[PDB]
């Protein structure tokens, strides 16, 4: 529960970008029975940021509808555009921490087409939790 809170996953169908290290991998292992995660493609990142991209501005959830919003909050980190933000996420950049924390947790819908018959078992065993590794893109296409 604490791990999911520290990942800012405090509701169902909340999504977040995590840079993989030993520390973050050991974090995600604790939350594994409750999450589905994987390796996102560039088009998946772009669709997420374009459709459901919001920034944390003065502790408020603000739509990323103009590059001035991104510049005013991430211009000191050389992020001047939505494509700069997408690039910084995709190629995990020197300012990944600031860019991903500026991004409000993505609030996805339920999958169009549903889950598997039973979610709460590992993807390897025919469920939905754990690491699915490239099928996160298909799942995100379903949910975004």
């Amino acid at each position: 529960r604490k791990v999911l809170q520290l990942l800012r996953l405090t509701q169902i169908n909340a999504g977040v970008f995590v840079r993989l290290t030993k520390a973050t991998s050991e974090l995600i292992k604790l939350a594994e029975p409750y999450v589905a995660y994987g390796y996102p493609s560039l088009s998946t990142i772009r669709q997420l940021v374009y459709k459901r991209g919001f920034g944390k501005v003065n502790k408020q959830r603000i739509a990323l509808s103009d590059n001035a919003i991104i510049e005013a909050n991430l211009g000191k980190f050389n992020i001047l555009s939505i494509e700069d933000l997408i690039h910084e996420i995709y190629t995990v950049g020197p300012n990944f921490k600031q860019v991903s924390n500026f991004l409000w947790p993505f609030k996805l819908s339920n999958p169009n087409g549903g889950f598997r018959a039973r979610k709460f078992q590992h993807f390897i065993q025919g469920g939905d939790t754990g690491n699915r590794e490239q099928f996160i893109n298909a799942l995100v296409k379903q949910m975004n």
Partner: protein
């Protein structure tokens, strides 16, 4: 009848190590403790004076007082919903310097040396420690190492 005496349940905790009973080697009495030193607490069963209570067996704290044969150690103990500062008097047989100080103090020295040398060479250096990162790409040569195919083995009884 319940028994909750001072040394209840310390049958194995306060035992000497196997083949390590008897006299205390004198480096224990030659170590020097200063106020502010971080020390581990480990009760020695053969010295019954100045012995810690079983709660402090295995705890690490700050030296605050130095007396003829003992040190005062500050421990933070959870009592309900907060911590309480405990002040324990321990003979030096039950005390050992904590090894975490020398490692952090070495990273401080190394950072100072690297920063000054990088300034001398006119470049920049990043001193923050990093967690282990996923490994990069690589090419595996198969000269002398052609892949060997394994299969699951049939069931056998070996009794």
């Amino acid at each position: 009848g319940k028994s909750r005496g001072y040394r209840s349940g310390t049958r194995y905790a306060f035992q000497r190590d196997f083949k390590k009973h008897g006299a205390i080697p004198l480096s224990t009495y030659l170590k020097v403790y200063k106020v502010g030193d971080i020390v581990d607490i480990k009760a020695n069963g053969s010295i019954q004076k100045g012995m810690p209570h079983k709660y402090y067996h295995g705890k690490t704290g700050i030296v605050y007082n130095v007396t003829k044969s003992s040190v005062g150690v500050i421990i933070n103990k959870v009592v309900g919903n907060r911590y309480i500062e405990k002040r324990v008097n321990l003979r030096v047989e039950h005390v050992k310097h904590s090894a975490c100080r020398q490692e952090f103090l070495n990273r401080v020295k190394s950072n100072a040396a690297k920063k000054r040398e990088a300034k001398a060479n006119g470049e920049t250096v990043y001193l923050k420690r990093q967690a282990a990162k996923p490994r990069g790409s690589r090419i595996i040569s198969t000269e002398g190492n052609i892949p060997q195919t394994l299969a699951p083995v049939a069931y056998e009884t070996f009794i």
